[PDB]
Design a protein around this ligand. Structure first.
Ligand SMILES: CCCCCCCC/C=C\CCCCCCCC(=O)OC[C@H](O)CO
Ligand SMILES: CCCCCCCC/C=C\CCCCCCCC(=O)OC[C@H](O)CO
Ligand SMILES: CCCCCCCC/C=C\CCCCCCCC(=O)OC[C@H](O)CO
Ligand SMILES: CCCCCCCC/C=C\CCCCCCCC(=O)OC[C@H](O)CO
Ligand SMILES: CCCCCCCC/C=C\CCCCCCCC(=O)OC[C@H](O)CO
Ligand SMILES: CCCCCCCC/C=C\CCCCCCCC(=O)OC[C@H](O)CO
Ligand SMILES: CCCCCCCC/C=C\CCCCCCCC(=O)OC[C@H](O)CO
Ligand SMILES: CCCCCCCC/C=C\CCCCCCCC(=O)OC[C@H](O)CO
Ligand SMILES: [Ca+2]
Ligand SMILES: [Ca+2]
Ligand SMILES: [Ca+2]
Ligand SMILES: [Ca+2]
Ligand SMILES: [Cl-]
Ligand SMILES: [Cl-]
Ligand SMILES: [Sr+2]
Lengths: 25, 25, 25, 25
């Protein structure tokens, strides 16, 4: 398990990556 | 919970994202 | 140990970095 | 504490940020 703030930050990080890829695609 | 260095790195990562968005906005 | 979602996100983050470097190289 | 791979990934992430800032500066 992780600190809740770390889980949240990682979810945000992944969504950022998805949105970046979709933007470029 | 997380390693303190990981918590710190994630806080920095999120602030970086906020500042990036504000810069572009 | 970390949340499995955090491990996964970090692996993805590192692969992203590798692919970015290889793209620029 | 965190998975060792997560600690490593976060250290790499921070160094990446430092090198990016120094490059732009
Ligand atoms: C291109 C712009 C960058 C992208 C902008 C996207 C910002 C998304 C913000 C919030 C959604 C994600 C947050 C989800 C947080 C849920 C709470 C949580 O995960 O807590 C778990 C905890 O471990 C339980 O105690
Ligand atoms: C248009 C773009 C579409 C937007 C798509 C964005 C999806 C975000 C991706 C992953 C976060 C969701 C993962 C949620 C699972 C979290 C539960 C967890 O944190 O721990 C589970 C672990 O396996 C047990 O400890
Ligand atoms: C665009 C440039 C990139 C952005 C530049 C921003 C750099 C921010 C640096 C430090 C502030 C954040 C650090 C906050 C650290 C607090 C200590 C901590 O979080 O420790 C928790 C631990 O788990 C308890 O034992
Ligand atoms: C001009 C731009 C404005 C700058 C805005 C930047 C704000 C940084 C965002 C989040 C870090 C703060 C989150 C602090 C909470 C940390 C406590 C924690 O780490 O764990 C809590 C958990 O819910 C129990 O384990
Ligand atoms: C340039 C585009 C960005 C790059 C696109 C790359 C996307 C890669 C996606 C998935 C592979 C990585 C996921 C590996 C996940 C394995 C599952 C896991 O790690 O779970 C561990 C857990 O702790 C055990 O319970
Ligand atoms: C063309 C580009 C080539 C692609 C290359 C991408 C490689 C991805 C890098 C690291 C993820 C693999 C690390 C796997 C180890 C995970 C096991 C773990 O999570 O914990 C281990 C810890 O030491 C005990 O707790
Ligand atoms: C611009 C290019 C991107 C930047 C390229 C930089 C790549 C740096 C690679 C490795 C150094 C960092 C790795 C340090 C890893 C030490 C091992 C560790 O941290 O393990 C802790 C564990 O928790 C104990 O069991
Ligand atoms: C030219 C550029 C100069 C390069 C500069 C790059 C420095 C990398 C930054 C941070 C990683 C080092 C942090 C090492 C501390 C790790 C120990 C830890 O992981 O846990 C400690 C925690 O407080 C107890 O659990
Ligand atoms: Ca906490
Ligand atoms: Ca430690
Ligand atoms: Ca979980
Ligand atoms: Ca492990
Ligand atoms: Cl990142
Ligand atoms: Cl973690
Ligand atoms: Sr943990």
């Amino acid at each position: 398990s992780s600190d809740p703030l770390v889980v949240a930050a990682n979810i945000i990080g992944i969504l950022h990556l998805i949105l970046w890829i979709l933007d470029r695609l």
